[model samples]
Target chain A: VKQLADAVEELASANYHLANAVARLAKAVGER
Target chain B: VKQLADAVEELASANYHLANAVARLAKAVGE
Candidate 1:
């Protein structure tokens, strides 16, 4: 139980990082 | 579950402020 939930939580944390990266890229590109 | 859930929620709230700051920066940069 702990292992499976922990895995998903980790993925969500990674997703946050990915989203932040994309957001920064979009800002750099001057998204329109 | 609950602690993880609360953290994720807080992240969302933090992002809201970040988004506002980004928007302001974009406007300043003529983006």
Candidate 2:
């Protein structure tokens, strides 16, 4: 997952930002 | 929530198994 994360990171900062956004969304939804 | 997550997991496990069962039925129907 780290490597997959890194490749996405290398492709574009947008991907990294999107991944973080999704993680936050999932966490928020999980909490609620 | 790891401790509380257990009850959720049990319920989710039943759901998951139900899903797999349905999938198997679908495959049988499909094939």
Candidate 3:
């Protein structure tokens, strides 16, 4: 159970990072 | 089985959100 929670937490973190990267790229393109 | 299924569902949802964001970003960059 604990392992499953940890795995979910990691997935959430990775998703958050990807979202941030996407937002940054969008902003850069808008600026150009 | 139900608990495991929920975990997978949550991961899938998160993955979907990430993919959507990527697509939007790609469109913005392409334009």
Candidate 4:
């Protein structure tokens, strides 16, 4: 359970960063 | 535009899996 929790936290953080990256890319495309 | 679209699709797929993992974890915790 602890391991699963840790994995979830790690993945969630990764997803958060990825979402921000996608948002930035979209913004850049919109500007072009 | 093409590159951005590809990136977006890749991220969306990853995000979908992450979301499912999170949901499963939450369910485990709740049980």
Candidate 5:
């Protein structure tokens, strides 16, 4: 359970990081 | 171009990391 918990936490962080990265890239292209 | 390129690279890495995390989580669930 705890190990899964740790992994999902990493998943959340990865999702957030990926989202922000895409936003930056989109803004750079004048799409956001 | 440079900033966008770097962001895309980071995006790639994050996606890879997330994919690995999901597989590990699935394995932990024993399904």
Candidate 6:
């Protein structure tokens, strides 16, 4: 449940690099 | 250019359900 905020952070920062961006997002959604 | 807008909306609303929410964002981000 609390992972939502970090997920959103990664998501919002994902505008330039698709692979790198999605990775950030996936990681955020996944751990911590 | 585009991912910014919706991501902002989701961030404000992101208070639970981590997985499903991120899946939707990936769609909005990739395809």
For model 5, the DockQ equals: 0.05
**Model 4, range A1-32, lDDT digits (tens) per residue?**
55555555566567877656655555455455
Q: Rank candidates, lDDT, best first.
A: 3, 1, 4, 5, 6, 2
The best candidate by lDDT is: 3
Interface RMSD of each: 4.8, 15.2, 2.2, 16.9, 17.5, 12.7
Q: What is the CA-based DockQ of model 2?
A: 0.03
lDDT of 6 by residue, A1-32 (tens): 33555556656554324445457677656654
Model 1 Cα lDDT, one tens digit per residue, B1-31: 7766755665666566567656655674674
Cα lDDT of model 2 by residue, B1-31, tens digit: 4434444455455555555555555555555
Instruction: Pick the winner on lDDT between candidates 2 and 5.
Output: 5
Winner of 3 and 5 under TM-score: 3
Proportion of native contacts in model 1? Answer: 0.00
By DockQ thresholds, what CAPRI class is model 2? incorrect
Extract clashing residue pairs from model 2. Answer: none
Native contacts recovered by model 2: 0.00
lDDT tens readout by residue for model 3, B1-31: 5665676777787788788778878888778
Error of 3 at A28 (Å): 3.0
Show the lowest summed lDDT stretch of 10 residues, model 1 chain A. A1-10
Question: What tens-digit string does per-residue lDDT give for candidate 3 at A1-32?
Answer: 86886677678768868877887877788777
Please give the distance, in angstroms, between residue A10's alpha carbon in candidate 6 and its true position after superposition: 23
Candidate 5: Cα lDDT at A31: 37
Per-residue CA lDDT of candidate 6, range B1-31, in tens? Answer: 2455556556544433354455568656554
Please rank every candidate by DockQ, starting with the best.
Answer: 3, 1, 6, 4, 5, 2
Q: Write the per-residue lDDT of candidate 1 for residues A1-32, one digit (tens) a residue.
A: 56655665676676566557656765666654
User: Each model: TM-score of chain B?
Assistant: 0.77, 0.71, 0.85, 0.85, 0.79, 0.40
Higher-TM-score candidate among 3 and 4? 3
